[PDB]
Amino acid sequence: HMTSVFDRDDIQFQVVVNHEEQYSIWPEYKEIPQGWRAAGKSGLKKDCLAYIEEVWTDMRPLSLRQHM
Amino acid sequence: EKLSELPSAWSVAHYVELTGEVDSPLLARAVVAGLAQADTLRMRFTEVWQWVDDALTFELPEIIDLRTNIDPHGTAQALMQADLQQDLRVDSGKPLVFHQLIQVADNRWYWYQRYHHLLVDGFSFPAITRQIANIYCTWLRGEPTPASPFTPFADVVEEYQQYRESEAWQRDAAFWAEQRRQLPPPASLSPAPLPGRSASADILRLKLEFTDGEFRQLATQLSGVQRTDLALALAALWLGRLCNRMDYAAGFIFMRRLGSAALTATGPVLNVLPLGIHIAAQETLPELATRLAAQLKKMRRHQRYDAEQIVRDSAAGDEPLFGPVLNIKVFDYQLDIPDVQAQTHTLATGPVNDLELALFPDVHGDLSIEILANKQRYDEPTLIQHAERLKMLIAQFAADPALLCGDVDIMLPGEYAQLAQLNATQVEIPETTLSALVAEQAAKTPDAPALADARYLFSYREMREQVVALANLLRERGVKPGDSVAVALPRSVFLTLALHAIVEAGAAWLPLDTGYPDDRLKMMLEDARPSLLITTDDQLPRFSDVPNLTSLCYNAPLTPQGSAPLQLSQPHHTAYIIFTSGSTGRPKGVMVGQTAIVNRLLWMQNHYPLTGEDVVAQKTPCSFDVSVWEFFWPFIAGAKLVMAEPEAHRDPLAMQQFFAEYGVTTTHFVPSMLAAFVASLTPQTARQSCATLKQVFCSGEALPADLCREWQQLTGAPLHNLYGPTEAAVDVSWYPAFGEELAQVRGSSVPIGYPVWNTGLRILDAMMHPVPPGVAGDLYLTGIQLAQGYLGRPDLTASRFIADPFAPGERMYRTGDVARWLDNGAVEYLGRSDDQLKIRGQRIELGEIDRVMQALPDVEQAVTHACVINQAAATGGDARQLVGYLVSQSGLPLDTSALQAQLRETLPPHMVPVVLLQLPQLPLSANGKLDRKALPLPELAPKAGSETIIAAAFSSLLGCDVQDADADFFALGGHSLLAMKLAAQLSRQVARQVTPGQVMVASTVAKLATIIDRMGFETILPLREGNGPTLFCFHPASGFAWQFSVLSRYLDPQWSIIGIQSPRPNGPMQTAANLDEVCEAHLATLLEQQPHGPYYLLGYSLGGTLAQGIAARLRAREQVAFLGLLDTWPPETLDPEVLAEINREREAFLAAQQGELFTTIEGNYADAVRLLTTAHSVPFDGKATLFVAERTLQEGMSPERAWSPWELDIYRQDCAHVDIISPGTFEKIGPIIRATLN
Ligand SMILES: *P(=O)(O)OCC(C)(C)[C@@H](O)C(=O)NCCC(=O)NCCS[C@@H](CS(=O)(=O)NC[C@H]1O[C@@H](n2cnc3c(N)ncnc32)[C@H](O)[C@@H]1O)[C@@H](N)CO
């Protein structure tokens, strides 16, 4: 009966990006993990997810894009 | 007469150490007088009646002089313990008080005191002690006896009765009712369940003073925060963080009496009341301390309300309201007697349920704590450890008072080292693919057996030829490296070949389950957009509707053209795509790369090595990722893989016959299917089938330890527990499920164990912080084995694949599994944090089913609930079934049958609720949180001659007497596992063979009786449809060429086997009274198979006559390169013994088949002898091949001279005329035939 934070919509997340340009959500009250940077989006969970939906277009990792 | 049950016998004991000149007799008389003053100390219980007897008397305390003892102190301790170890009789007619004066030195005394727990508590006994001391000193000054300050027993029950009838009683009762209404469940620092009322009076006491000075700095930084509330906030956060729970019910010590009424009282005062605690991860420490201080401030106005009353109104248990209890109070033990120092030592405070934590901040600003723990639930070093956690807990806030309650770290420096050791799985693997490994192993052992089924058997070279060929065909159909190929194929060699070929062309394979509805499949294909679909000719009409989808029918081998690898596969390519149920929208596909599954298979080959003697089974459907290590792992070790029959993975008996047939050494099981399999096992069947098993693996469910011990005793085959989601390339963690590690498992489930190669396990809390051992937390997966992501869905990917705080730049997969790590570092599966369920190994999201059902017409809301419909249907395994509860928007009946049949067109078969129930209103309870315990269970007619036994079997397995036919077996509580045992039962109760799949496709009495009560019976029997040359097999006296089924395995895979036979309804054997009308009738079918080209023929008995008789008939026309004869004799040799031989052929033919309208067999034997008595033979100018049974008749003119006027070569095996066609002889004849046909 944990009910994880990522499953809760009552909390507000923020969009983070690594070096491979892979997007993810992260709790706003927590420090952004090392090797990750904010993409300029925060707020409600479904909102951040809907943002990621349109921003993340090429699912390939960055290092495999030039080889493609 | 106010009590029912008799109170317990535990007591409160202590002793006061008096260093100074003490007059012992006067002190004893002062004890008597002080005890006499308080009228509540004299109290007894008659049984039950709890009442005060004013006629009781007190005796002078015993004065022991231990100064002459070798160890006065230890002997005094032994005395006080000797009185304390004895239980106290409650029903005695004597006072329950005991005092004793012990002298250990000329100036030192131990003043032992003991009371029954209903007389005094930890707060009120120093009042009695202080009054005795007051009498003592007063008499030492020459003044008379002071009066009694203690409130008499009448005034306290008058006051209490006032409070009971007061207007504050109802107000407090309502307050605590609302409090226990919003009261969260209790927590505990001990993983063991919360017992409730405890019997052990022997507890563990631990006093610890923090000299770090951290609390003084934290308190001097927070000036406005009262030190008690600050230390209490620290304790609350400490408890919540150590238990990984933000909301938990602790206990707090209040007082039922206040002011002087508490200081002049003798009876119990302290009142432990329930305290709900909510930790906020965003709050600072002052906010928690403030909110908690206001909470206690509100609780203190109602603290006069007794706690046993809160239990009373609520009550049956068993779990208590709160585990731990926090004490901030300080008890004043000091007393002033001239020229003598008094120190009160504690001996017995009574039993503790779980844990008592008392906090004492001093006037200097530092912090001391007193821990009272249950000796059965705790031990001292662990308490020291938790205290250290609290120490660094305080230090962190002292250094940074702006620290959030969520960012605080409670893990010790050594545990991080443990986690660093356990997750250090770095193993350097080569950059490679599946095709490169398979090609390498094939280059190692080309002539070794690799792939096989009931018809085909490939060596590694032949298999690689077929893989390369099919890959080139796929490439000719436009399948480029990086594409996807959907697969809808029954279980045969061509499924394996298909997957290997798909990988060979640089593509990924998309397994399709044809049992799913067309809508879901079309959705999947619209998402994946595959380049090609590999299926059979009969399943193509299903996919003729799918737009923009090229198809391909692959059921036969192709002409081999090289075995060289194409080298088109790259490590960054997707290997396989497997769709799983989504909790939000349409199902999501899991893209698993090549390097991931390479690491998985290479690890599985290192940790569980396989050799060429090993035989791996193909039991797992292609729609499950487990099958991935069945399709490839045997081919990277040189082992052999064998296909099972379709839907034989649901039949335990078929698994027994399969294992026994191929000598399987390696297989897989789902714990539910393992239980259903050992349920079919008897020790002799286990030693007749499971004797070849050297390695068995279980994954997908929590693995019961009892099932593992039962499997160990019944078989002895090593069992292994594996764990992983689909998004982690099959399995991530491993653990031995047999022998020593199994015998040490204390829990009910075998741990999921330790991580594989280049993979890491991370059990975090709600704050993304790692949890200490024994504490449940959310499970997260790291490493090279993670999936590439969800296909074409960035949102679900970014939601489920998150950032990794302990590995910079790397990602981390949120399983939703709740787990914890043990003292041996092994991870133990505990449960789920979401609505996802694993029903008999099947991954099912309840949210999808809910959304689909509430998308139905005229449905306000619908709820899916998995439950055991019939409790008598639980023999082991997962007996849960899906039940849907619907409510109509209009209030009108919903017609649940049509709604279920409508659900079958969207959801997979196993995700469709077996029962849909309509409710007037969805059963809520308190806050509208949907009470699932209020959800009712579904309630538990021809019945003709044969189906009466079916109803009897239903009534046997379900325990419910079934009078009505047309009754669904599943809606009555049945499920897959029980349907297996049903199939066995009916199979022994009916001459026909009953399979559980027939129960699946038709679940009723009438339907099961309807079905219960292949290639064809036509002239052409397609034994094996190949491509190249064709070997024609002629029918024996039975008229059926079925017995050649076991020949197709030994022949070269390019060959075709078409058996000719006699379908008695207008068949050649009966329409001919001349035994050449049939030898020339078969030319009408043989010449319309292959008109030209050489001919390859084989016959047995009568079929051999028909072999030579056609051989010369074709030699008078093309050529016959091979004509085999199986113990065939010329008709010139109505004889008496040949009828016995024919009778043996018939007997062994029909007795080898347990199943009517097949009496045509008995006809084709009649028509045989009627035709056999008319002699017919032709010298046959060509040559042929002959196999002779050595144990047959005499006459040394045996075929070498008997067939001489008809060139030939003879092979001699030891068998009868009947056994020459048996599989045991074909184990030699087969290879000979193939070597002859080369
Ligand atoms: P009836 O029509 O109900 O017939 C019943 C039978 C048994 C015939 C039928 O259901 C059947 O054939 N079932 C086979 C089902 C099967 O093989 N499923 C695949 C196994 S799980 C798979 C990944 S998964 O995402 O599908 N499941 C992952 C999920 O499972 C839990 N889990 C895995 N391993 C666990 C262990 N060792 N302990 C506890 N829980 C475990 C996790 O919660 C995880 O999230 C494989 N990757 C598993 O190896």
Short mmCIF file of C-alpha atoms in Angstrom, two decimals, chain B residues 568-791:
data_model
loop_
_atom_site.label_atom_id
_atom_site.label_comp_id
_atom_site.label_asym_id
_atom_site.label_seq_id
_atom_site.Cartn_x
_atom_site.Cartn_y
_atom_site.Cartn_z
CA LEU B 568 22.98 -7.46 -40.82
CA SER B 569 22.17 -7.47 -37.08
CA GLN B 570 23.57 -4.65 -34.96
CA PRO B 571 23.70 -4.36 -31.14
CA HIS B 572 21.54 -1.21 -31.23
CA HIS B 573 18.67 -2.95 -33.06
CA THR B 574 15.47 -3.91 -31.28
CA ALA B 575 15.36 -7.67 -30.75
CA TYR B 576 11.72 -8.29 -29.79
CA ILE B 577 8.60 -6.21 -29.14
CA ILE B 578 6.07 -7.54 -26.62
CA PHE B 579 2.86 -5.67 -25.83
CA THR B 580 1.63 -5.53 -22.23
CA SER B 581 -1.57 -4.23 -20.68
CA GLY B 582 -1.54 -0.49 -20.08
CA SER B 583 -3.08 1.13 -17.02
CA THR B 584 -4.19 4.24 -18.95
CA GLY B 585 -4.85 3.89 -22.68
CA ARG B 586 -4.28 1.22 -25.30
CA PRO B 587 -1.70 -1.53 -24.65
CA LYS B 588 1.97 -0.53 -24.81
CA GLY B 589 4.80 -2.38 -26.54
CA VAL B 590 8.11 -3.09 -24.83
CA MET B 591 11.10 -2.65 -27.15
CA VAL B 592 13.96 -4.82 -25.84
CA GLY B 593 17.29 -4.28 -27.56
CA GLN B 594 19.83 -6.84 -28.70
CA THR B 595 22.59 -6.14 -26.16
CA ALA B 596 20.12 -6.52 -23.28
CA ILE B 597 18.95 -10.01 -24.23
CA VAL B 598 22.56 -10.89 -25.11
CA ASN B 599 23.59 -10.07 -21.54
CA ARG B 600 20.58 -12.00 -20.24
CA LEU B 601 21.33 -15.14 -22.26
CA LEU B 602 25.10 -15.04 -21.71
CA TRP B 603 24.51 -14.68 -17.97
CA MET B 604 22.01 -17.55 -17.97
CA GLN B 605 24.61 -19.63 -19.82
CA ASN B 606 27.35 -18.82 -17.31
CA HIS B 607 25.29 -19.21 -14.13
CA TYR B 608 23.36 -22.27 -15.43
CA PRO B 609 25.73 -23.88 -17.96
CA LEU B 610 24.28 -26.04 -20.74
CA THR B 611 26.00 -28.76 -22.78
CA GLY B 612 25.24 -30.76 -25.91
CA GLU B 613 23.67 -33.52 -23.81
CA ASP B 614 21.02 -31.05 -22.59
CA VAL B 615 17.50 -30.80 -24.03
CA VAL B 616 15.53 -27.56 -23.62
CA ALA B 617 11.74 -27.55 -23.95
CA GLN B 618 9.52 -25.09 -25.82
CA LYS B 619 6.51 -24.78 -23.52
CA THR B 620 6.08 -21.01 -23.26
CA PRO B 621 3.77 -19.22 -25.72
CA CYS B 622 5.54 -16.71 -27.96
CA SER B 623 3.44 -13.92 -26.41
CA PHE B 624 5.43 -14.33 -23.17
CA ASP B 625 9.01 -13.06 -22.90
CA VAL B 626 10.09 -16.20 -21.00
CA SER B 627 10.00 -18.02 -24.34
CA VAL B 628 12.83 -15.72 -25.51
CA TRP B 629 15.37 -17.79 -23.58
CA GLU B 630 13.73 -20.96 -24.91
CA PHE B 631 14.11 -19.83 -28.54
CA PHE B 632 17.80 -18.86 -28.31
CA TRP B 633 19.65 -19.93 -25.14
CA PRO B 634 19.94 -23.62 -26.17
CA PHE B 635 21.47 -22.47 -29.49
CA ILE B 636 24.34 -20.54 -27.87
CA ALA B 637 25.46 -23.56 -25.82
CA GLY B 638 25.18 -26.37 -28.38
CA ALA B 639 22.11 -27.87 -26.69
CA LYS B 640 18.93 -29.16 -28.35
CA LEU B 641 15.50 -27.51 -28.41
CA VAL B 642 12.25 -29.46 -28.78
CA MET B 643 8.79 -28.12 -29.62
CA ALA B 644 5.80 -29.13 -27.57
CA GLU B 645 2.38 -29.69 -29.06
CA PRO B 646 -0.01 -26.74 -29.33
CA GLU B 647 -1.82 -25.87 -26.08
CA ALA B 648 0.09 -28.69 -24.34
CA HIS B 649 1.41 -26.14 -21.80
CA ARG B 650 -2.06 -26.22 -20.19
CA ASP B 651 -2.06 -30.02 -19.78
CA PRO B 652 0.18 -31.48 -17.03
CA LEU B 653 -0.23 -35.01 -18.41
CA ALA B 654 0.82 -33.83 -21.87
CA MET B 655 3.84 -32.21 -20.21
CA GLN B 656 4.67 -35.56 -18.59
CA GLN B 657 4.43 -37.39 -21.92
CA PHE B 658 6.46 -34.61 -23.55
CA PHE B 659 9.26 -34.61 -20.96
CA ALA B 660 9.39 -38.41 -21.04
CA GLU B 661 9.36 -38.46 -24.85
CA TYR B 662 12.26 -36.08 -25.50
CA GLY B 663 14.12 -36.51 -22.21
CA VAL B 664 13.85 -32.82 -21.40
CA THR B 665 16.66 -31.59 -19.16
CA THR B 666 15.66 -27.90 -18.95
CA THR B 667 12.19 -26.34 -18.73
CA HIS B 668 10.17 -23.53 -17.13
CA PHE B 669 7.12 -23.23 -14.89
CA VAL B 670 4.80 -20.58 -13.49
CA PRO B 671 4.32 -21.25 -9.73
CA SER B 672 0.60 -21.78 -10.30
CA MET B 673 1.32 -24.17 -13.18
CA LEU B 674 4.00 -25.79 -11.02
CA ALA B 675 1.38 -26.46 -8.34
CA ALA B 676 -1.06 -27.77 -10.95
CA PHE B 677 1.77 -29.97 -12.28
CA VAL B 678 2.85 -31.51 -8.96
CA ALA B 679 -0.86 -32.08 -8.29
CA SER B 680 -0.92 -34.51 -11.24
CA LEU B 681 2.29 -36.18 -10.04
CA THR B 682 2.65 -39.47 -8.25
CA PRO B 683 6.19 -40.59 -7.27
CA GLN B 684 6.21 -43.21 -10.03
CA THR B 685 5.00 -40.72 -12.64
CA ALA B 686 7.63 -38.31 -11.31
CA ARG B 687 10.38 -40.91 -11.75
CA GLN B 688 8.91 -41.84 -15.16
CA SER B 689 8.76 -38.28 -16.54
CA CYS B 690 10.68 -35.75 -14.44
CA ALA B 691 13.73 -38.02 -14.04
CA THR B 692 15.61 -36.27 -16.87
CA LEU B 693 15.07 -32.73 -15.53
CA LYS B 694 18.37 -31.20 -14.42
CA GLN B 695 17.30 -27.52 -14.22
CA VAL B 696 13.80 -26.07 -13.68
CA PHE B 697 13.03 -22.33 -13.50
CA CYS B 698 10.06 -20.47 -12.00
CA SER B 699 9.16 -16.83 -12.60
CA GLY B 700 6.19 -14.50 -12.95
CA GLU B 701 4.72 -15.06 -9.47
CA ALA B 702 5.75 -15.18 -5.84
CA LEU B 703 7.24 -18.66 -5.51
CA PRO B 704 5.87 -20.61 -2.51
CA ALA B 705 8.54 -22.34 -0.43
CA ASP B 706 6.26 -25.25 0.51
CA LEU B 707 5.71 -25.96 -3.19
CA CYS B 708 9.50 -25.93 -3.66
CA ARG B 709 10.09 -28.42 -0.84
CA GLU B 710 7.31 -30.61 -2.23
CA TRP B 711 8.87 -30.43 -5.70
CA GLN B 712 12.27 -31.25 -4.19
CA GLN B 713 10.94 -34.34 -2.39
CA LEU B 714 8.89 -35.56 -5.36
CA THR B 715 11.63 -35.05 -7.98
CA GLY B 716 14.97 -33.87 -6.61
CA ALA B 717 15.51 -31.67 -9.68
CA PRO B 718 17.19 -28.31 -8.96
CA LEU B 719 14.65 -25.46 -8.91
CA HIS B 720 15.51 -21.78 -9.39
CA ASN B 721 13.49 -18.63 -8.71
CA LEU B 722 13.88 -15.81 -11.25
CA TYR B 723 12.39 -12.32 -11.25
CA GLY B 724 11.92 -9.52 -13.74
CA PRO B 725 9.37 -7.50 -15.69
CA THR B 726 9.04 -7.47 -19.46
CA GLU B 727 10.71 -4.03 -19.48
CA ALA B 728 13.91 -5.58 -18.08
CA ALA B 729 14.71 -8.19 -20.75
CA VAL B 730 13.07 -11.28 -19.21
CA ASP B 731 14.63 -11.72 -15.75
CA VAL B 732 16.76 -9.52 -13.50
CA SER B 733 17.29 -11.40 -10.22
CA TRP B 734 18.01 -15.04 -9.35
CA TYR B 735 17.84 -17.22 -6.25
CA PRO B 736 18.22 -20.95 -5.47
CA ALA B 737 14.88 -22.61 -4.71
CA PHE B 738 16.25 -26.01 -3.63
CA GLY B 739 18.32 -27.58 -0.90
CA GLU B 740 20.24 -25.48 1.60
CA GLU B 741 19.03 -22.02 0.58
CA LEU B 742 15.48 -23.39 0.49
CA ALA B 743 15.68 -24.88 4.00
CA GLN B 744 16.80 -21.50 5.40
CA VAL B 745 13.79 -19.60 4.01
CA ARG B 746 11.72 -18.37 6.95
CA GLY B 747 9.06 -16.59 4.90
CA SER B 748 6.28 -18.12 2.83
CA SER B 749 7.83 -17.09 -0.52
CA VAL B 750 11.25 -17.80 -2.01
CA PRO B 751 13.25 -14.54 -2.31
CA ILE B 752 13.77 -13.08 -5.77
CA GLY B 753 17.44 -13.00 -4.82
CA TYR B 754 20.50 -11.33 -6.32
CA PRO B 755 20.92 -9.31 -9.54
CA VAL B 756 22.25 -10.72 -12.81
CA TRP B 757 25.18 -9.45 -14.87
CA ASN B 758 25.57 -5.68 -15.32
CA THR B 759 22.27 -5.11 -13.49
CA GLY B 760 21.41 -3.32 -10.26
CA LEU B 761 18.56 -3.53 -7.75
CA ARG B 762 17.59 -0.39 -5.83
CA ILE B 763 14.92 -0.49 -3.11
CA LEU B 764 14.04 3.15 -2.41
CA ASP B 765 11.44 4.78 -0.18
CA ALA B 766 8.75 7.37 -0.96
CA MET B 767 11.53 10.01 -0.96
CA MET B 768 13.81 8.17 -3.43
CA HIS B 769 16.13 7.29 -0.53
CA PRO B 770 17.46 3.74 -0.06
CA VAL B 771 15.79 1.80 2.75
CA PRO B 772 17.52 -0.14 5.55
CA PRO B 773 17.24 -3.95 5.53
CA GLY B 774 13.93 -5.51 6.50
CA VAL B 775 12.03 -2.36 5.49
CA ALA B 776 9.61 -2.43 2.56
CA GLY B 777 10.20 0.01 -0.27
CA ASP B 778 9.58 0.59 -3.96
CA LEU B 779 11.75 -1.51 -6.28
CA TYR B 780 13.77 0.07 -9.10
CA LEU B 781 15.93 -1.57 -11.77
CA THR B 782 19.19 -0.30 -13.29
CA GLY B 783 21.78 -1.50 -15.77
CA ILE B 784 22.36 -2.72 -19.32
CA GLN B 785 19.31 -5.02 -19.34
CA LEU B 786 16.67 -2.26 -19.32
CA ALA B 787 14.30 -1.97 -22.25
CA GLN B 788 14.73 0.69 -24.92
CA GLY B 789 11.32 2.04 -23.92
CA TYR B 790 7.67 1.86 -24.92
CA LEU B 791 7.14 1.85 -28.68
#
